[PDB]
Design a protein around this ligand. Sequence first.
Ligand SMILES: Nc1ncnc2c1ncn2[C@@H]1O[C@H](COP(=O)(O)OP(=O)(O)OC[C@H]2O[C@@H](O)[C@H](O)[C@@H]2O)[C@@H](O)[C@H]1O
Ligand SMILES: Nc1ncnc2c1ncn2[C@@H]1O[C@H](COP(=O)(O)OP(=O)(O)OC[C@H]2O[C@@H](O)[C@H](O)[C@@H]2O)[C@@H](O)[C@H]1O
Ligand SMILES: [Gd]
Ligand SMILES: [Gd]
Ligand SMILES: [Gd]
Ligand SMILES: [Gd]
Ligand SMILES: [Gd]
Ligand SMILES: [Gd]
Ligand SMILES: [Gd]
Ligand SMILES: [Gd]
Lengths: 159, 159
Amino acid sequence: RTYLYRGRILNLALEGRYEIVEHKPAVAVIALREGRMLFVRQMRPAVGLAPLEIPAGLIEPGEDPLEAARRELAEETGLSGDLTYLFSYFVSPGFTDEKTHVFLAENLKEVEAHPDEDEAIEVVWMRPEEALERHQRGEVEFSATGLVGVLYYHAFLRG
Amino acid sequence: RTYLYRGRILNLALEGRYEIVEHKPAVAVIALREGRMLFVRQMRPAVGLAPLEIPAGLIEPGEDPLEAARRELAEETGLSGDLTYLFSYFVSPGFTDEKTHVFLAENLKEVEAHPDEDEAIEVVWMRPEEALERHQRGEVEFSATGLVGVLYYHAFLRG
Ligand SMILES: Nc1ncnc2c1ncn2[C@@H]1O[C@H](COP(=O)(O)OP(=O)(O)OC[C@H]2O[C@@H](O)[C@H](O)[C@@H]2O)[C@@H](O)[C@H]1O
Ligand SMILES: Nc1ncnc2c1ncn2[C@@H]1O[C@H](COP(=O)(O)OP(=O)(O)OC[C@H]2O[C@@H](O)[C@H](O)[C@@H]2O)[C@@H](O)[C@H]1O
Ligand SMILES: [Gd]
Ligand SMILES: [Gd]
Ligand SMILES: [Gd]
Ligand SMILES: [Gd]
Ligand SMILES: [Gd]
Ligand SMILES: [Gd]
Ligand SMILES: [Gd]
Ligand SMILES: [Gd]
């Protein structure tokens, strides 16, 4: 495996004829409250639009999945909760090793008296049914984390 | 956006401080039959293991999503069926523009008298319940397509 580029959140390498992109692992948090799921949107230069996602981020040096999940939820929404590990997935094993760990957040609580808002992120509480409905009409795009959250909801959280 | 590398299935570029990986779009096919979902496994150099996935592939030049879906299902499993577009998602909008289009395949039929097997792929018909169960114990890994298929099943195909 020879490297062509070593960067901030990724390295580009070649293994034979295989182009490989090493990428830090990540976390995603599904949070439901009063029939609404906590989605987030932000400027995504790579795609040129802001898809519907759920709180998520890269695991930082020194962090395990659970810890990164707590930090991302706290930093992007100013919330904490009781987290439960659900499952993980490789975003695109055909070229990258980025692995995402998904958690469920319950009993949401303000991290502090007056949470410090994240300017780069837009918090969007929305019924998972609406997110899917709108996506089906081509009105909104999904990130893998957003779609996984929506599907997980329909499969195990309704009622 | 300046390019550092132009390759076969991806280009590495820089947009300001953002590292961007342009990648061809892809397709995935969820197929259920007799309580079993059609999963596939193959050597994935990027991750060093063979996660549980569903028939999937890159959209080739000249193809639209539906056509690529038909080809991948045919080439990886030797099957055809009535396809229905379900939804799409960006695998990791934080660094790549790879977008995946998911379809449902019903009324599966042999593409030909004696289907030509794909040596690089391992076809694994398995109950989605078992896939999830085993993954939960750390016995098998999931690709985004595999997890999406499993969750979709639990949300809309049981009964
Ligand atoms: N990183 C790579 N570099 C060069 N050639 C590759 C690579 N990955 C696959 N190939 C070649 O392309 C052919 C398969 O093409 P695809 O139709 O795109 O399917 P595949 O890559 O096997 O799986 C596609 C989808 O699953 C996930 O891994 C990923 O998200 C991707 O969108 C194979 O015969 C293989 O030789
Ligand atoms: N391509 C990039 N290049 C350089 N810096 C980046 C990039 N993407 C994000 N950043 C920087 O990192 C910080 C955010 O880090 P993360 O915690 O990793 O979260 P984010 O990248 O915003 O979303 C993470 C997850 O969602 C999906 O887009 C993707 O699958 C990723 O795993 C931001 O302040 C931003 O400046
Ligand atoms: Gd984030
Ligand atoms: Gd972050
Ligand atoms: Gd504060
Ligand atoms: Gd609606
Ligand atoms: Gd494939
Ligand atoms: Gd293929
Ligand atoms: Gd044949
Ligand atoms: Gd079992």
